[PDB]
Design a protein around this ligand. Structure first.
Ligand SMILES: Nc1ncnc2c1ncn2[C@@H]1O[C@H](COP(=O)(O)OP(=O)(O)O)[C@@H](O)[C@H]1O
Ligand SMILES: Nc1ncnc2c1ncn2[C@@H]1O[C@H](COP(=O)(O)OP(=O)(O)O)[C@@H](O)[C@H]1O
Ligand SMILES: [Mg+2]
Lengths: 378, 58, 239, 135, 278, 232, 248
């Protein structure tokens, strides 16, 4: 009782001071003390100590080794519950360390036992982690399946506010990744934001960010500002909020210059987030396509320089984008690089008569083969 | 075994629901876990849900 | 559905006792309305006094009954059933005083009347009395107390309540009233009661068309205001 | 206040962005002037008040299902501009359950381009059910 | 000569001008139910090659069960608007008629009309009236209603396989209804339409108020976060009543005070309650 | 079989006493109430939501004491609740007079169930349209029972009756553990009522009583407010 | 119709309310009784087995009436409770009057007489409870008795009532050896017949309660088997089934 509290407070202070080797040595030294105490209490303490050790930025590479040695200690002492706790946190650490393949392997090798065991909260957490690493691996259908399994298991137990907030976060992220319906992604992100706010967790701000991002993807950027001036959003107002505000303003004004300026300014909050970066790049590409089509209706043989001046980008970027649209069977036209022009025409239909004539020629080629099958009877 | 006394049309529904899970996962094969959970969905039983009523008959 | 509404002991398939609801509807058959307001240190009841005949002795038309020197009641519904419940309540109060020495609280008066009503509801022997009773009394250590008793046997205390035809409207007006915090003086309590009745009836309220019973902490005796006092209260209300 | 806005200024509903209110119940004792009030306001706007006399407008009547619906719709609103009423003023307001479901299907929600405004004046308050109290 | 087939509205036969004009966008937050209904009655009529590839005989009958005013009929309307088949709408009250043998005759006429205009979708609306459990009948009315149910069962999955038609049903309870109707062969899918929660309610509010004028100070969240269990019909009623309250006070912009008043008005659902049932 | 839904002394051809089931339906249409037993005691909570501010919240208390160590809440008709409370108190006093020891919870539940049964064995009398959740503490062990209009009594570990009782039971089996404590019990019961409570839980809208070793005590509104603040 | 009142004879002389109670007995949980040399046992299914139901009586279907008597129960809960309390009262009245335990059969008849009253006098619904009786006395030793809602009773060596009663009685007819049956064989037979009659597989022990009656040094001990011995009985049944599988 006194010893446990002293160990936990010493670990907290040490993590504040950041001596990874000392914390690891303390964890090894308190191993005999774990047998002298109860099971659930020892699991709680080991989980707290490992969390304090892992949370700090001391990326010395001994984190995975410490987790593996804790797992081997648990296997030696046959403490299955704490063992699965270590595996779950190891999967989380692997996901956060961009070591997705081993995270996938550990999750796959653990999910069987966690399905056998009735601790469905850990199973929900591991299923969410599997969905997260699948989405990070671009395997969207598998991530969606894992998320659906996580939700099915979640609607059978009491989900704490943190677990429900994580569930809503991942559901909104998955819905956003499948760019077919953004209203439900926004709703799930708002639910995750409320759940995270109820516990004052940091990730709440991320939720807010995604909600604003969602409000941009239904080409309604104004509400983003209306979302920032909301009772729960004043507390989280900051550099990221103004970043999304100016991005929404650029989208509202249909200005790619403003969009690129906003991206360059808040490069830390618009490129370091994979979801935000991907969706904003997609939105910028669509806006570029729309404006290129808009300024191409009047002309017939306009130069690339004039279009670049109209839309305010580089000539090379405009030329590459135009070539991409032409190649992808978008707006019809051909670029003349020799003088610098993009001609436009009216794409003559196909002359259905000739296509049907070709089909008939093939059909009576078949008929002639059939007659060749005949006429063998002299 | 997992279908203790079905109707026979419930078996066809079980196969159809396993195929539906395969379709929703965009695959063409069917797995054993898929079949078992399709059985669970098709075998949905509605109990009294009122222990007061169930405890009338001791 | 409505084929289960001929015996008070028969539960409808939805679990509803329709005969009790029919007694509740019969509450409004009297055609009058009564409003009770509990002030900071007083309780007041005002009831419609409809004498549609110059031949009636206006003294005996009263719907206000003194159950006990400190506990007063106002009745709504059929007059015969209301008077029967009044005598039953008076007998219960006398029995309580005789068997326990001290005066019965209004709490227990309504509780016992509601128990009798419930017994009539569960045993299909007597038709439930379709009369609503409102009791006012100065209960020591609790100040004024206003209680309502229904044919169903559900007794409840009220800061302010009403019964009769215009029950929903009067209750809504009171709900609008008791919400804005105010000094609930005795004059203020009478003012609230009379304003409720007038607003729900849209009647100029000549002093002979209403009856007011009053109990106060200063004098914990059930007092029925004379017509002169009713006129004084009305003229104070108008200005 | 209930009817003149749908007649005089239907555009204010678009200004706020809401479907016009259809079901307005002028419930009260018969013979007190309900249809008189309706005719008075109709003459105030000179709009053809087509009070329903069942025939060519019966809908809920279970003898025929969809032909009666067709008569209800086409005879009024389309041919005759607007302003409707109903007979048996307390009949449908109060197989009876199925009759109520069919009434709800008849009245639930129709296109506002064509007006089937159901200004009912049922004679009693107890002849109502919560299934109609929805706006 | 042979005249062109004069197939017309007949019973309902929703024409291209009679579409309900309700889209999936008009529906706020019914993701699971939308997905199930689209897999059942929209995907087979367009992407049948996937069903052939798996070889699973896509379902023919679905039933939406849940509290009233939760969007079953509107989802049927949305399916009608976004379908390439011949939609048929009918409630389980038009079948019950006098002149015994017209109910089953109507059922078989509707199913034959759907077969003729294949592909077709039959949305059987509120069905608690005629789908009830076939308990031992002893009267003419009971015999006829059980006859109607039997004709429905025979037409939905009988000796004559219809093929290329779909059946959609609505119910409030789903604890009732004959197990023959709930057979996987007849009603393969049973979707539940529960009361909207804090998530679905937010989507419903955003969808309904996306057309209204509203105002800056109107924060729908203050009404979403309320723990009251209200349905999509309740959300729509609240919005319409708030708009009418704003209009009555001669205001073209809906304020928060009218929203609060309308929410308080709609929330009140005790009425009398007689205060002893509670 | 509607012809057998009127008589309380007539078996249906399927052998069901329909009127008792109708009384149980009336019970299920009552105000939500929850009762959960933890290793430290029992907790009974109920929704005392009035139709308006006019109703005096403190006038009538839904959670009532039977003995010093026995409490009892209800779901269903209100007036029948008072009759059952009076009969339970009288039975407890009779047992105390006979045996000089406070009545065991199981014995009181049995006698109250018999009393409720007495109203289901004759025509012209209506079954008690209320279900009772009774808490008691004897022999260093909590006891929670549910008595029904049918006279059937069980030994619920954790349950909910009244409106949305299915929702309360579904919320249970999730937030309920047999090794909880009285404080955790109070929190879980308040949450379970929140799953079926429409509006803000004002301290006067919820009545909670605790059956612990010291006896049965109904929580004062101050403690209810403190627990609600700790929960919300 | 002639089923509105318990005292109305049908034109064919059938009391329809009594037959309705008898058929309603089928709704009650399966309870079975087997007699054997030096023993007699009851078994019953717990039916409602929800995880939130605390099991504090341990004998929700088995009751101890006298020192050397026990009864099962299958019927309405309230009728079962009053019938068991009145059985105990009759047994104790007999013991007080004669200073000798009531010889089983008489007790049955006593209760049965009372049930007959509810099928004869008007205004009273017939007791919709049928119950088994096991006991021992100085006259006929171990005895097993079957009762009906009509108040008719009968001696038996192996019989069951409640859910799937016909299947249980057929199985007992097939697998009972008169004269050469012991307590262990009776317990095994009860376990197997409960497994077959209960649609649930593997016959989980906490869903079944077994109470035995045996004479031990003139003390007629009545035991209710705890869960632990039912675990090993279920394991024994499973291993016999596995051994019988060897034929394939
Ligand atoms: N305010 C009024 N002024 C003049 N006459 C009236 C008034 N109200 C009712 N009436 C008379 O009473 C009758 C009202 O009938 P009405 O209310 O239209 O019955 P219903 O509404 O059932 O058709 C008419 O004949 C009319 O002459
Ligand atoms: N998710 C939703 N989004 C928007 N509106 C809804 C939603 N759910 C219900 N509503 C509103 O509620 C009404 C429900 O009507 P209906 O579909 O007939 O209910 P039910 O089918 O449950 O009886 C619709 O008119 C619609 O305007
Ligand atoms: Mg509908």
């Amino acid at each position: 009782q006194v010893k446990e509290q002293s160990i936990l407070e010493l670990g907290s202070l040490l993590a504040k001071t950041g001596q990874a080797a000392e914390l690891g040595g303390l964890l090894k030294y308190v191993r005999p003390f774990l047998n002298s105490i109860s099971k659930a209490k020892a699991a709680r303490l080991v989980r707290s100590l490992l969390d304090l050790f892992l949370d700090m930025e001391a990326a010395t590479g001994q984190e995975v080794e410490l987790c593996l040695e804790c797992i081997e200690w648990a296997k030696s002492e046959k403490r299955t519950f704490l063992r699965q706790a270590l595996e779950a946190r190891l999967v989380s650490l692997y996901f956060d360390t961009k070591r997705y393949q081993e995270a996938l392997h550990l999750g796959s090798q653990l999910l069987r036992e966690l399905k056998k065991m009735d601790d469905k909260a850990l199973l929900v957490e591991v299923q969410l982690l599997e969905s997260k690493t699948y989405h990070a691996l671009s395997n969207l259908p598998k991530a969606r399946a894992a998320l659906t399994s996580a939700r099915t298991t979640a609607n059978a137990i009491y989900c704490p506010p943190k677990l429900q907030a994580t569930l809503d976060m991942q559901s909104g992220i998955i819905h956003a990744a499948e760019e077919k319906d953004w209203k439900t992604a926004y709703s799930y992100f708002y639910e995750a934001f409320e759940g995270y706010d109820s516990i004052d967790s940091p990730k709440a701000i991320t939720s807010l960010k995604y909600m604003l991002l969602c409000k941009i993807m239904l080409n309604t950027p104004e509400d983003v500002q209306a979302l920032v001036s909301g009772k729960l959003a004043l507390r989280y107002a900051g550099r990221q909020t103004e970043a999304l505000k100016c991005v929404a303003q650029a989208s509202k004004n249909r200005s790619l210059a403003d969009f690129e300026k906003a991206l360059t300014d808040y490069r830390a909050e618009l490129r370091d987030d994979p979801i935000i970066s991907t969706h904003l790049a997609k939105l910028y590409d669509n806006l570029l396509e729309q404006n290129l089509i808009r300024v191409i209706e009047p002309f017939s043989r306009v130069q690339i320089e004039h279009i670049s001046s109209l839309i305010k980008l580089s000539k090379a970027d405009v030329e590459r984008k135009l070539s991409q649209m032409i190649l992808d069977k978008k707006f019809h036209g051909i670029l003349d690089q020799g003088e610098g022009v993009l001609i436009i025409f009216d794409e003559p239909p196909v002359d259905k008569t000739y296509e049907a004539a070709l089909e008939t020629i093939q059909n009576m080629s078949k008929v002639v083969d059939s007659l060749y099958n005949k006429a063998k009877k002299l | 075994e997992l279908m203790p006394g079905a109707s026979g049309a419930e078996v066809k529904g079980v196969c159809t629901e396993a195929g539906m899970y395969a379709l929703r996962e965009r695959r063409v094969h069917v797995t054993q876990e898929d079949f078992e959970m399709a059985v669970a969905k098709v075998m949905q039983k509605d109990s009294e849900k009122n222990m007061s009523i169930k405890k009338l008959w001791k | 559905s409505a084929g289960f509404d001929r015996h008070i002991t028969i539960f409808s398939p939805e679990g509803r006792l329709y005969q009790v609801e029919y007694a509740f509807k019969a509450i409004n058959q009297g055609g009058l309305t009564s409003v009770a307001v509990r002030g900071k240190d007083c309780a007041v009841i005002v009831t419609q006094k409809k004498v549609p005949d110059k031949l009636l002795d206006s003294s005996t038309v009263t719907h206000l009954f003194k159950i006990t020197e400190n506990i007063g009641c106002v009745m709504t519904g059929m007059t015969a059933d209301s008077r029967s419940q009044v005598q039953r309540a008076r007998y219960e109060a006398a029995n309580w005083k005789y068997k326990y020495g001290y005066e019965i609280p209004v709490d227990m008066l309504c509780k016992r009347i509601a128990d009798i009503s419930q017994v009539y509801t569960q045993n299909a022997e007597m038709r439930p009395l379709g009369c609503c009773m409102i009791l006012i009394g100065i209960d020591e250590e609790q100040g004024p107390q206003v209680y309502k008793c229904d044919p169903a046997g559900y007794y409840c205390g009220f800061k302010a309540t009403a019964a009769g035809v215009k029950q929903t409207e009067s209750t809504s007006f009171l709900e609008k009233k008791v919400k804005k915090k105010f000094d609930w003086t005795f004059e203020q309590t009478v003012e609230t009661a009379i304003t409720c009745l007038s607003t729900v009836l849209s009647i100029d309220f000549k002093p002979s068309e209403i009856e007011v019973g009053v109990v106060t902490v200063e004098n914990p005796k059930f007092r029925i205001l004379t017509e002169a006092e009713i006129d004084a209260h009305l003229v104070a209300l108008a200005e | 206040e209930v009817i003149e806005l749908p007649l005089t200024n239907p555009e204010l509903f678009q200004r706020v962005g809401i479907i016009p209110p259809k079901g307005c119940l002028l419930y009260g004792p018969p013979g007190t002037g309900k249809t008189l009030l309706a005719r008075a306001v109709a003459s105030q706007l000179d709009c053809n008040f087509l009070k329903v006399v069942s025939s060519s407008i019966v809908d809920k009547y279970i003898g025929e299902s969809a032909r009666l619906i067709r008569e209800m719709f086409n005879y009024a609103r389309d041919h005759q501009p607007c302003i409707i009423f109903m007979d048996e003023i307390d009949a449908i307001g109060g197989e009876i359950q199925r009759t109520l479901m069919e009434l709800l299907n008849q009245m639930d929600g129709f296109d506002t381009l064509h007006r089937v405004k159901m200004i009912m004046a049922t004679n009693r308050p107890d002849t109502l059910d919560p299934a109609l109290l929805r706006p | 000569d042979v005249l062109p087939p004069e197939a017309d509205s007949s019973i309902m036969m929703l024409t291209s001008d009679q579409k309900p004009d309700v889209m999936y966008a008009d529906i706020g937050g019914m993701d699971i139910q939308k997905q199930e209904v689209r897999e059942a009655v929209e995907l087979p009529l367009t992407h049948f090659e996937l069903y052939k590839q798996i070889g699973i005989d896509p379902p023919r009958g679905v039933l939406m069960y849940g509290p009233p005013g939760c969007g079953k009929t509107m989802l049927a309307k949305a399916v009608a608007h976004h379908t390439t088949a011949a939609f048929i709408r009918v409630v389980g009250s038009e079948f019950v008629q006098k002149y015994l043998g017209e109910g089953p005759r109507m059922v078989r006429d509707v199913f034959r009309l759907a077969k003729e205009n294949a592909p077709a979708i039959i949305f059987i609306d509120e069905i608690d009236a005629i789908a009830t459990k076939r308990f031992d009948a002893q009267t003419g009315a009971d015999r006829e209603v059980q006859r109607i149910l039997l004709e429905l069962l025979n037409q939905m999955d009988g000796f004559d396989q219809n093929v290329n038609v779909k059946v959609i049903m609505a119910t409030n309870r789903a604890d009732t209804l004959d197990p023959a109707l709930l057979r996987p062969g007849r009603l393969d899918r049973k979707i539940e339409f529960p009361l909207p929660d804090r998530r679905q309610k937010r989507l419903i509010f955003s969808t309904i108020t996306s057309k209204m004028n509203l105002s800056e100070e109107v924060d729908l969240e203050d009404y979403v976060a309320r723990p009251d269990k209200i349905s999509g019909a309740d959300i729509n009623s609240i919005c319409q009543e708030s708009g009418m309250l704003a209009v009555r006070e001669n205001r073209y912009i809906v304020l928060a005070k009218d929203f609060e008043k309308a929410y308080k008005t709609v929330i009140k659902k005790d009425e009398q309650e007689h205060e002893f049932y509670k | 079989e509607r012809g057998y839904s009127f008589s309380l002394t007539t078996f249906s051809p399927s052998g069901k006493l329909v009127q008792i089931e109708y009384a149980l339906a009336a019970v299920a249409g009552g105000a939500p109430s929850v009762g959960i037993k933890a290793a430290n005691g029992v907790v009974l909570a109920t929704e005392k939501k009035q139709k308006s501010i006019l109703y005096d919240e403190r006038s009538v208390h839904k959670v009532e004491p039977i003995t010093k160590h026995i409490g009892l809440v209800y779901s269903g008709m209100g007036p029948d609740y008072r009759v059952l409370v009076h009969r339970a108190r009288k039975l407890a006093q009779q047992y105390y007079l006979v045996y000089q020891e406070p009545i065991p919870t199981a014995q009181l539940v049995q006698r109250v169930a018999s009393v409720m049964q007495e109203y289901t064995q004759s025509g012209g009398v209506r079954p008690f349209g209320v279900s009772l959740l009774i808490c008691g503490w004897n022999e260093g062990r909590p006891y929670l029972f549910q008595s029904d209009p049918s006279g059937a009594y069980f030994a619920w570990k954790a349950t909910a009756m009244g409106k949305n009782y299915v929702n309360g039971k579904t919320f249970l089996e999730k937030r309920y553990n047999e090794d909880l404590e009285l404080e955790d019990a109070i929190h879980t019961a308040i949450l379970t009522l929140k799953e079926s409570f429409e509006g803000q839980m004002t301290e006067d809208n919820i009545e909670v009583g605790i059956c612990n070793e010291a006896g049965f005590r109904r929580l004062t509104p101050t403690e209810v407010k403190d627990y609600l603040a700790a929960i919300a | 119709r002639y089923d509105s009142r318990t005292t109305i004879f049908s034109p064919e002389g059938r009391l329809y309310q009594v037959e309705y109670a008898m058929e309603a007995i089928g709704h009650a949980g399966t309870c079975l009784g087997i007699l054997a040399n030096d023993g007699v046992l009851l078994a019953a299914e717990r039916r409602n087995i929800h995880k939130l139901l605390d099991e504090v009586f341990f004998s929700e279907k088995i009751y101890k009436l006298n020192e050397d008597m026990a009864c099962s129960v299958a019927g309405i809960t309230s009728d079962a409770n009053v019938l068991t309390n009145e059985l105990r009262l009759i047994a104790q009245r007999y013991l007080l009057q004669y200073q000798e335990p009531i010889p089983c059969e008489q007790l049955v008849t006593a209760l049965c007489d009372i049930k007959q009253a509810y099928t004869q006098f008007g205004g009273k619904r017939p007791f919709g409870v049928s119950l088994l009786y096991i006991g021992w006395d100085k006259h006929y030793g171990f005895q097993l008795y079957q009762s009906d809602p009509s108040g008719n009773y009968g001696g038996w060596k192996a019989t069951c009532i409640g859910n799937n009663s016909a299947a249980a009685v057929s199985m007992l007819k097939q697998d009972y050896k008169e004269g050469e049956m012991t307590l262990k064989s009776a317990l095994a037979l009860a376990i197997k017949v409960l497994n077959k009659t209960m649609d649930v597989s593997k016959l989980s022990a906490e869903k079944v309660e077994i109470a035995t009656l045996t004479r031990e040094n003139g003390k007629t001990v009545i035991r209710v088997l705890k869960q632990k011995e039912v675990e090993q009985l279920i394991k024994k049944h499973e291993e016999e089934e596995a051994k019988a599988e060897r034929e394939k």
